[PDB]
């Protein structure tokens, strides 16, 4: 158990690293949203739900990382 | 088997790291969509399905990462 | 018990790495805010609440990393 | 054999990391496609096959990583 | 004791890596500030507080890393 | 034998990491091709061979990584 | 004590990695300064102190890494 | 002798990582070439020999990584 | 001492990784200088010393990395 | 000797990683050179030696990495 439990804990730490992509990704989507709206205010009702979709899809990949982390931590 | 289970769990942690690319990638596809539509609203119906295709192809690489991760956790 | 504990400490160091994403992320949101406002100052009240949401959502991923880190530390 | 097998699983995890290049890359190709089409809608039939070519070639790099991964998992 | 101590020291070093995100992030914010002031000098007093805020928030994430690094060290 | 074999397998996995550079690089080349053709469609036949060359050369580096990975495997 | 000391030196090496954020960051600030001054030479006296501020604050992050490094090397 | 050899194989896998730099690097040179030529087609004969030098110098760093890799493999 | 010398040598290897930032940083300062002068040749004498300052501050972070590396190899 | 020699060899592999920064950096300088010359052909005699300086300074950081690698490999 001891070496295996230790591996799970190290593993759970390693598995959060990929969350960096969601962190950068979410920001990239919101940067585009802010730049697009500032170039063309009239487009905001159109581009805002693309921003919400984009952020959610990007966050999803981070959530897959987190899921593996929790399965290691608690499973 | 202690060493092998340990290695399976470390390895599953490690195979989520690659998801950072789909995280960044999906975001890049949505940012282009946002900037594209704001420059030229009339193009929206043309470029939106391209965004869907882009996101899905970028996501697939992260899903491969996760597939290995699940194979190491359960296979 | 010592091996497990050693692994809890390493794992905790490792789970902060992901916070780099929020570091760059928050910055990217605020950079667009500054550039957007400078190109079009009248858009400020519109894009400021968007920057707050952007930063919050980006920070949240970093906060997930830190949650794992603290779960491992205690 | 336990150390060797251990190494094989650690190795398989490691060899998905390079898939992040394809996750980001495929996205860069789709972003250019979206941006090019929004700048110049008439160019769409020309630039779309280039996007398919760019994506398949970017994806091939991630597939090489996954192949090495599967060689480690099952061989 | 020696295994645990060892892990605390390695873990402490590992938790400084995430600080690369604030190093890049802070810079991105100040670059946006510079590019925006040079495009539009009259906007200086509006975007400056935005840059302070954005820097503070980027930095905080690097500070959560240092915090974990200090917990492991002390 | 077991230690050496072990290292060959870990080393083989490690040498695929560098392939992320070709994955990004190839894409950068094709994006430049797309942005340049859409700005200037008449340039298509000039820049296309340039993109093939640039892709080939980016890819080669990922292939040197795979080569090391295959040597370690076989 | 040998394992502990070992760990201290491995740790000290590890804690210089984060200095790459300052190496890139300081450069991003100087690049903006150069580009801003070439677009608008009259803005130089305004944007130069902002560049000093941005750089010192970016550098401070690398210095925190180096401090942890020196704590590991000598304490 | 087995431990040393194990380390030669791991070290060799590790030294290919740096080749990612040349992967992205070569691509960045060729992207600028394509964009430069599309903006200004008459500059092609001037910027093509610059792209060749750029790619060569970038590849060379990758070749240094591979040299270490082969020195370790034999 | 076997373990400690081993750790010193691994650690010295690891503390060079941070030099990748000065590598990228210096380049970013020179790229801005190049793009700055080409947009506005008259600015050359103004922005060139800024480039020198930029490069040197970016390089210093890599020199800190190397300092630790030498301390681990010889100190 | 055995564990120490093994550490040096692993260390020498780790120390080439930072060469990735010179590889990207050198390219960034040459990209700027190519973009600057294509915007403004008359500037080429001015910006070319800044490109040579930039690439050399960037390559220098990679050479510091390589130096540590050779000291580990052969020292």
DSSP per residue over chain D, as a string? -HHHHHHHHHHHHHTTTTHHHHHHHHHHHHHHHHHHHHH-GGGHHHHHHHHHHHHHHHHHHHHHHHHHHHHHHH-
Q: Which two tokens stand for residue F32?
A: 């430049």
Return the number of other C-beta atoms located less than 10 Å from residue H7's C-beta. 27
Look at residues A48, A27, A49, B33 and name the one whose alpha carbon lies nearest to residue D36: B33
Q: Which domain covers residue I28, as residue numbers?
A: 2-75
Q: How far apart are CA D33 and CA D36, in angstroms?
A: 5
CB atoms under 10 Å from CB of C57, counted, come to: 24
What is d(CA C36, CA A2) in angstroms, rounded to the nearest whole number? Answer: 54
Q: Is J49 on the interface with H (CB under 8 A)?
A: no
CA atoms of I3 and H62, how far apart (whole Å): 31
- Neighboring chain J residues of H68 at a CB cutoff of 8 Å: 12-13, 16, 66, 69, 73
Whether E20 and C20 have beta carbons less than 8 Å apart is answered as yes
Chains that touch A (3 or more CB pairs under 8 A): B, C
Which residue, I39, J2, J9, F18, is CA-closest to D21? Answer: F18
Sequence-ordered list of residues with C-beta below 8 angstroms from that of F10, at least 6 positions apart, any chain: D7, D10, D11, D14, H10, H13
What is the sign of the dihedral through the CA atoms of C50, C54, C60 and C62? negative
Q: Which residue has the tokens 């080749």?
A: H19
* Residues in chain G after which the chain is broken, C→N over 2.5 Å: none
At H26, list the tokens. Answer: 């070569």
The answer to whether chain F touches chain H by having 3 or more C-beta pairs less than 8 angstroms apart is yes
Structure tokens at B42: 């009339």
Residue whose entry in the numeric block shows the structure tokens 């608690």: A74
The CATH number covering residue J10 comes to 1.20.20.10
- E19, E41, E73: residue with CB nearest G61: E19
Contacts of F20 in chain H (CB under 8 A): 20, 23
Q: Quick one: residue E40, left, alpha or beta (phi over 0 = left, psi -120 to 50 = alpha)?
A: beta
Are G18 and E23 within 8 A, CB to CB? yes
Nearby residues of F17 by Cβ (< 8 Å), 6 or more positions away: D14, D15, D17, D18, F65, H16, H17, H20
Please check whether residue B3 touches D, CB under 8 A. Answer: yes
**Separation between Cα atoms, residue F14 and residue D11, nearest integer Å:** 7
Contact assignment for B57 to D30 by CB distance below 8 Å: yes
Nearest 5°: the CA angle A51, A52, A56 is 115
d(CA C70, CA D13): 25
I70 vs chain J: nearest CA distance in angstroms?
A: 8
Give the count of beta carbons closer than 10 Å to the beta carbon of residue G46: 15
Structure tokens at I43: 């600015």
Q: For residues A15 and B15, what is the distance between their CA atoms, to the nearest angstrom?
A: 8
Flag if J18 and I14 touch (Cβ within 8 Å).
no
Q: Could you say which DSSP state residue A42 is in?
A: G
Cα C62-C63-C66 angle, rounded to 5 deg:
95
Structure tokens at A14: 């390693």
Burial class of residue F21 in the structure, from the number of CB atoms within 10 Å of its CB (0-12 exposed, 13-18 middle, 19+ buried): buried
Q: Which of C6, C19, C73 sits opposite E4 (nearest CB)?
A: C6
Q: State how far the alpha carbon of G72 is from the alpha carbons of A72, B10, E10, I19, in Å.
A: 30, 26, 9, 20
Cβ atoms of residues A52 and C52 within 8 Å: no
What the block records as the tokens of F6 is: 């072990």
Of B13, B27, B39, the CB nearest to A11: B13
CA distance I6 to I11: 9
**In C, which residues are within 8 Å of E70 by CB distance?**
none
Say yes or no for a CB contact (<8 Å) between G14 and E19: no
As a whole number of angstroms, the distance between CA J32 and CA D75 comes to 47
CB contact under 8 Å between C62 and A13, yes or no, is: no
- The Cα of A57 is separated from the nearest Cα of chain B by a number of Å equal to 7
Contact yes or no for E29 and C31 at CB 8 A: yes
Task: Identify the DSSP state of C18.
Answer: T
Structure tokens at A57: 């899809």
Within 13 Å, how many C-alpha atoms sit on residue E37's CB side?
A: 30
Tokens (6 digits) for F67: 């080569």
Determine whether the interchain pair J50/I41 forms a contact, defined as Cβ–Cβ distance below 8 Å. Answer: no
The answer to whether A23 touches C22, Cβ cutoff 8 Å, is yes
The total of structural domains in chain E comes to: 1
Sign of CA dihedral C10, C14, C19, C24: positive
Residue H8 CA, chain-centre distance (Å), reads: 22
DSSP secondary-structure letter at C41? G
Contact B37, D38 (CB under 8 A): yes
| Contact status of H63 with chain J (Cβ, < 8 Å) | no
H 5-34 residues with CB < 8 A to F: 5-7, 9-14, 16-34
Residues of chain E found within 8 Å of residue C16, distances taken between Cβ atoms: 14-15, 17-18, 64-65, 68-69
Q: Which two tokens stand for residue A7?
A: 């591996």
Token pair of J27 as six digits: 């390219």
For E74, the 3-state DSSP assignment is coil
CB nearest D3 (choices: F2, F23, F37): F2
Tokens of J63: 């050479």
Phi/psi at I67 (5° precision):
-65, -50
Locate the chain J residue with the closest alpha carbon to I45.
J46
CA-to-CA distance for J8 and J21, rounded, in angstroms? 22
Q: How far is CA A16 from CA A6, B23, C52, D23, E68, in A?
A: 16, 13, 24, 18, 15
Euclidean distance between CA atoms C18 and A25, whole angstroms:
13
Instruction: Round to whole Å and give the CA distance between J12 and J4.
Output: 12
Residue of J68, J73, J74 to mutate, testing the I interface (most I Cβ within 10 Å of its Cβ): J68
Among the partner residues A7, A13, A30, nearest to C12 by beta-carbon distance? A13
> What does DSSP assign to residue A75?
-
**Token pair for C62:** 């970093």
Residue D33 to residues B47, B54, B71, H40, J24, Cα–Cα distance (Å): 9, 10, 35, 21, 24
- Put simply, the answer to whether H15 touches J12 (Cβ < 8 Å) is yes
H helical segments located in chain C: 2-14, 19-39, 44-73
Q: Are D73 and D8 in contact (CB under 8 A)?
A: yes
Under 8 Å between Cβ of C32 and E35: no
CA-CA distance, C15 to C26, in Å (whole number)?
A: 19
Asked if J36 and H36 count as a contact pair (C-beta separation under 8 A), the reply is no
Q: Which residue has the tokens 């790459």?
A: G20
For residue C45, give both structure tokens.
């009240």
Burial classification of residue J52, based on how many CB atoms lie within 10 Å of its CB (0-12 exposed, 13-18 middle, 19 or more buried): middle
Q: How many CA atoms lie within 13 A of H40 on its CB side?
A: 17
Residues in chain B: 75
Contacts of residue J42, Cβ cutoff 8 Å, sequence gap at least 6: none
d(CA I62, CA D42): 48
Contacts H–J by Cβ distance under 8 A: 157
F15 three-state secondary structure: coil
Angstrom distances, CA of residue B7 to CA of A10, B1, F3 = 11, 10, 15
CA-to-CA distance for I32 and I57, rounded, in angstroms?
15
């Amino acid at each position: 158990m001891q070496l295996v439990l230790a591996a799970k804990y190290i593993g759970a730490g390693i598995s959060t690293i990929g969350l960096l992509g969601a962190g950068i990704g979410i920001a990239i989507v919101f940067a585009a949203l802010i730049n697009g709206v500032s170039r063309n205010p009239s487009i905001k009702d159109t581009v805002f739900p693309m921003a919400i979709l984009g952020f959610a899809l990007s966050e999803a990949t981070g959530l897959f990382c987190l899921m593996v982390s929790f399965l290691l931590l608690f499973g």
